[PDB]
């Protein structure tokens, strides 16, 4: 039961993530997570980034996972779980445009 309410929602896709952040949720710099329906069932890291020239928006970072145990959105860095990686990304982005949720859903 990771944060289940900050940088990870559960088994969501990229369509619900884009309308989940823009449709009442948080400002930019908010990176949530969710299971990617692109592969058998990988993970994901949606992001919120509004702009002063079009409106709000939302990107995504498909998260992968080593069979040996290594959660990594980019092969440059993996971890043991999503709570442990949200722990490391909490202090750093890891390489993506922005790190996990910046503010606090609270």
């Amino acid at each position: 039961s990771i944060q289940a309410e900050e940088w990870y929602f559960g088994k969501l896709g990229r369509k619900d993530a884009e309308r989940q952040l823009l449709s009442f949720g948080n400002p930019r710099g908010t990176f949530l997570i969710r299971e990617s329906e692109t592969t058998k069932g990988a993970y994901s890291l949606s992001i919120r980034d509004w702009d002063d020239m079009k409106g709000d928006h939302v990107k995504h970072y498909k998260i992968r996972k080593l069979d040996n145990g290594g959660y990594y959105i980019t092969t440059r860095a993996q971890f043991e779980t999503l709570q442990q990686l949200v722990q490391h990304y909490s202090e750093r982005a890891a390489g993506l445009s922005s790190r996990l949720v910046v503010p606090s859903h609270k």
Binding site: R14, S36, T38, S44, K59, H60, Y61, K62, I73, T74, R76, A94, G95, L96, S97
Partner: peptide, 11 residues
Amino acid sequence: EPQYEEIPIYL
């Protein structure tokens, strides 16, 4: 048709 941004690492 990109489905996700993959952090690169080339020169």
